């Protein structure tokens, strides 16, 4: 056995983003990277890629009264169809 | 034992260094052979063909269209053991699933349409949800 190019040891691939969209809490673009205006004013534990980021019961991970803001634009909140939170 | 017929037909193409298209047509002739079988003989012919397709001597870029062709006769074919063998199929697509991904998409279109029209709504949406379609 002198060539058929059988298997040497090999090295591989990874990430780490997240298993969510999440699109930066679209209601504005003080990002989900960002503590936005209203939710730098509110600011739960929120970080430079999840200021609010998840496939939640909303899944519209929208900032506190930014999510409230685009619930203001429609109190039925079809954003991802959960009420602003 | 047209099981065995196709079996050694393919055991000797295992022993072949044929080219891409040429050896492809060899396996295709053996395929369409097994296709034109009839019953339980044709069933274990399916069994053994895919047992053939398992190897890497069977290339992935071989088994792509070879089992695509194995498949596209199956819409024409009975429904009971078609469900049966889509089950066993997918269970044996388990190993290199991404090698099978689009083909599986179609298998399960068929299979879930079966359960749908069999009103096996459980196993229908259930076994649909088996797939990572875009998540593959």
């Amino acid at each position: 056995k002198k060539k058929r190019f059988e298997v040497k040891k090999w090295n591989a691939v990874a990430l780490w983003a997240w298993d969510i969209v999440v699109d930066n809490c679209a209601i504005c673009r003080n990002h989900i990277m960002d503590l936005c205006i209203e939710c730098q004013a509110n600011q739960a534990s929120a970080t430079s890629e999840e200021c609010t980021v998840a496939w939640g019961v909303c899944n519209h991970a929208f900032h506190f009264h930014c999510i409230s803001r685009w619930l203001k634009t429609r109190q039925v909140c079809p954003l991802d169809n959960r009420e602003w939170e | 034992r047209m099981a065995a017929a196709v079996r050694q037909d393919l055991a000797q193409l295992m022993n072949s260094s044929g080219s891409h298209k040429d050896l492809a047509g060899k396996y295709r002739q053996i395929l369409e052979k097994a296709i034109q079988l009839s019953g339980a003989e044709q069933l274990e012919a399916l069994k053994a063909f895919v047992e053939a397709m398992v190897n890497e001597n069977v290339s992935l870029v071989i088994s792509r269209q070879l089992l695509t062709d194995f498949c596209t006769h199956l819409p024409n074919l009975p429904d009971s053991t078609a469900k049966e063998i889509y089950h066993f199929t997918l269970e044996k697509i388990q190993p290199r699933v991404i090698s099978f991904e689009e083909q599986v998409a179609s298998i399960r279109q068929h299979l879930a349409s079966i359960y749908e029209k069999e009103e096996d709504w459980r196993n229908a949406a259930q076994v649909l949800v088996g797939i990572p379609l875009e998540t593959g």
């Binding site: 059988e6 090999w10 990874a14 997240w18 298993d19 | 890497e56 290199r96």
Partner: protein
């Protein structure tokens, strides 16, 4: 940049069992594919050559493209 490739069965097991550990860990980014980690695996395959001549990523991929067929056109 990455494209189609052989990916023998252990590479399957690598991505998948890593995803076992890792979907356990994290999901949304996962065992993606990235060629430029690739290098050459051409070693004591069965060679009159005693030779292990590793190659770069797509060196590896395209030599993979030319393994058994002892000659191959464009």
């Amino acid at each position: 940049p990455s494209s189609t490739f052989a990916i023998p069965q252990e590479l399957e097991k690598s991505v998948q069992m890593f995803e076992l550990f890792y979907s356990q860990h994290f999901s949304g980014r996962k065992l993606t594919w990235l060629h430029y980690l690739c290098t050459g695996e051409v070693k004591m395959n069965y060679l009159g050559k005693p030779y292990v001549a590793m190659v770069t990523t797509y060196q590896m991929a395209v030599l993979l493209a030319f393994n058994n067929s002892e000659t191959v056109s464009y």
